Design goal:
Helix content of chain A: 40-55%
Keywords (chain A): Acetylation, Isopeptide bond, Proteasome, Ubl conjugation
Largest sheet of chain A: 6 strands, mixed
Protein name (chain A): 26S proteasome non-ATPase regulatory subunit 7
Bound molecules: zinc ion
Number of strands of chain B: 8
Organism (chain A): Homo sapiens (Human)
Radius of gyration of chain B: 28 Å
Pfam families (chain A): JAB, MitMem_reg
Shape of chain B: elongated
GO biological process, one term (chain A): proteasome-mediated ubiquitin-dependent protein catabolic process
Shape of chain A: extended
Oligomer: part of a larger assembly
Structural class of chain B: alpha/beta
Helix content of chain B: 25-40%
Order of helices and strands of chain A: EHEEEEHEHEEEEHHHH
Chain lengths: ~290, ~280, ~60
């Protein structure tokens, strides 16, 4: 079915520009619309969409309505201009999901066998690659609950297209690209420890909270399982590198050797040729 | 009577369907419609752009369905903003995006409907990322040849847009037409996330993910050694000697600075041992 | 295509493969390259019909 989704900045903006539409008139809830997907393969892609007036009451927390006269005839519009573009699901800006979201997908399953919902974010904050994606399946449960319909997270990734980077990538103009090979990889390293070890502390504090409160989630078992896959090397005191010690510097063996060999001859190219051309102009002029 | 140079405020949402709907018609030319509000004579804004059915038999003035707009405006009422129509646009991917013979026939028809009806063209081909490309024009009336034929006041917004002058046939259409200025009213809220969504997705996906060892340096040493002798024969070729050969010639680049950065790639990637671990 | 170019398109769409063995003369629209109907008959100009003769003014009794 649906494994991963591809969200373009163009269709994501179609949720963002509608945040100006109903944001000025208010009032409650969020921006919600129906998603037009482009499915060429198991990997899902999204090009365009259409935003529909939508509201969700608080009291009355289970009340939701799409406008389906907007959904029907406007489909024949986008279908007439683009035959490949069709509705794969819906979307909204979240930020989180209330329990009522179970009924939005099951209603529109007449349009698509499986409707994928995309939670987006109009204001970028944290922690990383934004928005979100969910898929609607039924896993029931191990405890014996009646059949449980819970949306499972779908990994979301941004993607590009020809001719769409004209105006999009133009307006920024302030970015330095990249530079690959010097700063590009090292800034990630400073962040790879930051973003790597912050979720380490956020989860290890919530995993300690388990014993305290919030149990379940037990989880189970996914938590410790892949944590023990992380445990191929801990790495703890001290590094257990006795076999990887001589191999540590042995990987730095040729990297330092070439860096010593290149800088020697690069100098011979830089130093000699500079002295030659310099004294040819300098002393022959005066 | 009084005519002042117009300034076009385009929304980042209206910029989407210009290139996107134009990409769907590639290679063939499409016909769209511009949506916006007329503030005054010297400024104009396009707040929305929508897609219209592409013509596989060629663009015509009847390609725009009036019941398509009448059903669209009604759907814009239940949508947040029901703004009145303004003008039209069309893609021209196959060439340098100039107004064709059909574009002038649909001018007097659209300029009768709406006052301005700015003619807007767009092309995918001229660039990819860092150029505005697109196009825009506005019909100056040929009946005005009796009157003064050189609008507009506040000139160089035209005059500067009259640069580069874009070859000949394009500005050959400057007879009976005059282009219009396109500036971006700030969407920067969306434009700030446009940079954040683009670069974060391009930074190692987590920034973590991405962060032929000696052999890649054995393949590099062929570029770091076997390339040296073909590079270091040139200073012996600079020795004539002396001097019958035409000079100067500079062979210093680009291999020297490439092997420099080649070590910059290999040194900081080897620092991943010291960086990631401890 | 008789222009000396050769193209690649899915099976028509409309008239199916029931007719016929590989032909010519069929109509197709501009660069869209879709064939609506398989059109007869053969070719060309005076090669198809050399001369059109109704009947002579004389009969076999004239000898
Ligand atoms: Zn045209």
């Amino acid at each position: 079915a649906v494994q991963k989704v591809v969200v373009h900045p163009l269709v994501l903006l179609s949720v963002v520009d509608h945040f100006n539409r109903i944001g000025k008139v208010g009032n409650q809830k969020r921006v919600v619309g129906v998603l037009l997907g482009s499915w060429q393969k198991k990997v899902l892609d999204v090009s365009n969409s259409f935003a529909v007036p939508f509201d969700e009451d608080d009291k009355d927390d289970s009340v939701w309505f799409l406008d389906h006269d907007y959904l029907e005839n406007m489909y024949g519009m986008f279908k007439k201009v683009n035959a490949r573009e069709r509705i794969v699901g819906w979307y909204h800006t979240g930020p989180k999901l209330h329990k009522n979201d179970i009924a939005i997908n099951e209603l529109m399953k007449r349009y698509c066998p499986n409707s994928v919902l995309v939670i987006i974010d109009v204001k970028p904050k944290d922690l990383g690659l934004p928005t979100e994606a969910y898929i609607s399946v039924e896993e029931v449960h191990d405890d014996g609950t009646p059949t449980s319909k819970t949306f499972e997270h779908v990994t979301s990734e941004i993607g590009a297209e020809e001719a769409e980077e004209v105006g999009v990538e133009h307006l920024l103009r302030d970015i330095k690209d990249t530079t690959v090979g010097t700063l590009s990889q090292r800034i990630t390293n400073q962040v790879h420890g930051l973003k790597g070890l912050n979720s380490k502390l956020l989860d290890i504090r919530s995993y300690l909270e388990k014993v305290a409160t919030g149990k379940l989630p037990i989880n189970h078992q996914i938590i410790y399982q892949l944590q023990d896959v992380f445990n191929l090397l801990p790495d703890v005191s001290l590094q257990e590198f006795v076999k990887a010690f001589y191999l540590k510097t042995n990987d730095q063996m040729v990297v330092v050797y070439l860096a010593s060999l290149i800088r020697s001859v690069v100098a011979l190219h830089n130093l000699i040729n500079n002295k030659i051309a310099n004294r040819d102009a300098e002393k022959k002029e005066g | 009577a009084v005519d002042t140079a117009e300034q076009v405020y385009i929304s980042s949402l209206a910029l989407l369907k210009m290139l996107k709907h134009g990409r769907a018609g590639v290679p063939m030319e499409v016909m769209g419609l511009m949506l916006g509000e007329f503030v005054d004579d010297y400024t104009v804004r396009v707040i929305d752009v929508f897609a219209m059915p592409q013509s596989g038999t060629g663009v015509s003035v009847e390609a725009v369905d009036p019941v398509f707009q009448a059903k669209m405006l009604d759907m814009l009422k239940q949508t947040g903003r029901p703004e009145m129509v303004v003008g039209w646009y069309h893609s021209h991917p196959g060439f340098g995006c100039w107004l064709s013979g059909v574009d002038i026939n649909t001018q007097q028809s659209f300029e009768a409907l709406s006052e301005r009806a700015v003619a807007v063209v767009v092309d995918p081909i001229q660039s990819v990322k860092g150029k505005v490309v697109i196009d825009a024009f506005r019909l100056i009336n040929a009946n005005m040849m009796v009157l003064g034929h050189e609008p507009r006041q506040t000139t160089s917004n035209l005059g500067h847009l009259n640069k580069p002058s874009i070859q000949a046939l394009i500005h050959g259409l400057n007879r009976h037409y005059y282009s219009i200025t396109i500036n971006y009213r700030k969407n920067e809220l969306e434009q700030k996330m446009l940079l954040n969504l683009h670069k974060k997705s391009w930074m190692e996906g987590l920034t973590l993910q991405d962060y032929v060892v000696k052999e890649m340096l054995e393949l590099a040493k062929n570029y770091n050694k076997a390339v040296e002798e073909e590079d270091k024969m040139t200073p012996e070729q600079l020795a004539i000697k002396n001097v019958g050969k035409q000079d100067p010639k500079r062979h210093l680049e680009e291999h020297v600075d490439v092997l420099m950065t080649s070590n910059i790639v290999q040194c900081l990637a080897a620092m991943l041992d010291t960086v990631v671990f401890k | 295509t008789s222009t000396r170019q050769t193209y690649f398109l899915p099976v028509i769409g409309l008239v199916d493969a029931e007719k016929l063995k590989p032909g010519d003369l069929v109509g197709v629209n501009k660069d869209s390259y879709l064939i609506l109907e398989t059109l007869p008959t053969e070719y060309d100009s005076r090669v198809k019909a050399m001369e059109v003769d109704e009947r002579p003014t004389e009969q076999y009794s004239d000898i």
